[PDB]
Amino acid sequence: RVNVTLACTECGDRNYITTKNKRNNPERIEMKKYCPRLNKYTLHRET
Template identity: 60%
Template sequence: MPREIVILECTECKRRNYTTKKEKRNTPGRLEFSKYCKFERKHTLHKERSK
C-alpha cells in the first residue's frame, strides 16, 4: 500500500502550510505536529486536513 500525501493546517490562522506523507495502516488517526507558522511567526499546532 503506498503512502498517502496529507496536508497540515495551522489551528490558529487556518492556512495550509505543510504537506507530508503517512502510512494509513500504521497511523489510522489524524496527525498533529507543533510546527512553525510563518504567518503567525511562532510555533503552533498543525493538524491533518483532507485535500
C-alpha cells in the first residue's frame, strides 16, 4: 500500500496524488482526470 503520482502528458505538471496496493495492482494505473490548463478531461498515468 503505497503513494502514487498521476501525471498529465500535456499539462506538464503532476497535481493528483492517490494510493494503491502494489500486490493487487502491480501494473501502472490510468484514469482520465480534469486538467485546469487545457480546460478539459485528459488521460493521466502513474509515474
